[PDB]
Amino acid sequence: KIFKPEELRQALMPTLEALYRQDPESLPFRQPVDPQLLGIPDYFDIVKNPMDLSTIKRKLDTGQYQEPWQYVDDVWLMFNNAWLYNRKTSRVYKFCSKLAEVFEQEIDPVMQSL
């Protein structure tokens, strides 16, 4: 089974759009964390592989995922980064947990279809 880049994009894009639709919960995740701008120099000492929704979308728009599990890996990487860096009751952590719930509720039938 080989995937065509625009077909893979059409199949997965609704799952990414569902994350983007969440307001306010997608807001911390719509752009890359910039530790200098945010004044959190420790960020890249804990998060070695940053990921965010804008980067996932760009990868999905430019054929960077050959297989659907590569996309699923990047979504979970974004989540796991936030769950490692932030306090459990912080806004970012709580918002992350909402996005992961949305992602769970949705990604199963899409993967079954691929």
Ligand SMILES: CNC(=O)c1cc(Br)c[nH]1
């Ligand atoms: C995904 N964003 C974060 O994990 C983050 C930004 C700031 Br400021 C603290 N945590």
